Amino acid sequence: LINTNGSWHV
């Protein structure tokens, strides 16, 4: 997972 704008996503 990576983080963008404070949230994690695949």
């Epitope: 997972l1 983080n3 963008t4 704008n5 949230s7 994690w8 695949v10």
Partner: antibody, heavy 117, light 112 residues
Framework: VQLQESGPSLVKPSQTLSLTCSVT????????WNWIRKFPGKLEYVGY???????YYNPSLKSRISITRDTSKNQYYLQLNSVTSEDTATYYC?????????????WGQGTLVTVSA | NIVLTQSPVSLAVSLGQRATISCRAS??????????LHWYQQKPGQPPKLLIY???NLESGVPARFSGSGSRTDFTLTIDPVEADDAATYYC?????????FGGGTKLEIKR
């Protein structure tokens, strides 16, 4: 990896606080590169610049801050505008990994910035 | 807003005993089957040190006297055995979603 903060000890109210983090032993083109501060009393998250240059800021600071980087120097920077006595704190830079290592694993020693006339 | 409320504010423990500290989140800090809840030690004049990440994983280079458990909104840090070098403030912190926040700290006193 080693991180080291640098910047002024004293900043006057209403001025811009500018800090630098110098990273050695690893490239800032991987990982997440963060700023955190500790007030004289509380720890507060300030924000990051990612491995690809995208940023994430504390929403209560978004109107006053900017995090930028220089991948050729392996440095990243914090700009905080219009400082007040409420911005007096120890400022830290710290590395975060991705989803499998999402803690702040490596930290600089911190630098105390006082906002006063 | 996600508020992390630690308990107790402070505690005193004897050498060799098992110490447990709590962190209660106002809303779940889980996503993707992971709890984005981590624990740090901080001593005076030093930056915080990562002990446990993702609620229960020991940070490499930290001795295995620290462990963690929990999910969703309730988390525990265990120090076992307590040693004199554990005199410090312990913090939880999440990074599940905006805004990322820290707990207020639990001060650990070593009895002697």
């Amino acid at each position: 990896v080693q991180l080291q903060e640098s910047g002024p000890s004293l900043v006057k109210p209403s001025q811009t606080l500018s800090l630098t983090c110098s990273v050695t032993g690893d490239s800032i083109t991987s990982g997440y590169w963060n700023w955190i501060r500790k007030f004289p009393g509380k720890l507060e998250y300030v924000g990051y610049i990612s491995y690809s240059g995208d940023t994430y800021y504390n929403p209560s600071l978004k109107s006053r801050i900017s995090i930028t980087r220089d991948t050729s120097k392996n440095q990243y920077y914090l700009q905080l505008n219009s400082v007040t006595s409420e911005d007096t704190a120890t400022y830290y830079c710290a590395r975060m990994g991705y989803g499998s290592q999402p803690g702040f694993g490596s930290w600089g020693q911190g630098t105390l910035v006082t906002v006063s006339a | 807003n996600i508020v992390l409320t630690q308990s107790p504010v402070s505690l005193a423990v004897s050498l060799g005993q098992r110490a447990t500290i709590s962190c209660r989140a106002s809303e779940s800090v889980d996503s993707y089957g992971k709890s984005f809840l981590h624990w740090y030690q901080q001593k005076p004049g030093q930056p915080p040190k990562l002990l446990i990440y993702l609620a229960s994983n020991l940070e490499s280079g930290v001795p295995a006297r620290f462990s963690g458990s929990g999910s969703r909104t309730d988390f525990t840090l265990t120090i076992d055995p307590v040693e004199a070098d554990d005199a410090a403030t312990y913090y939880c912190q999440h990074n599940n979603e905006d805004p990322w926040t820290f707990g207020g700290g639990t001060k650990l006193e070593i009895k002697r």
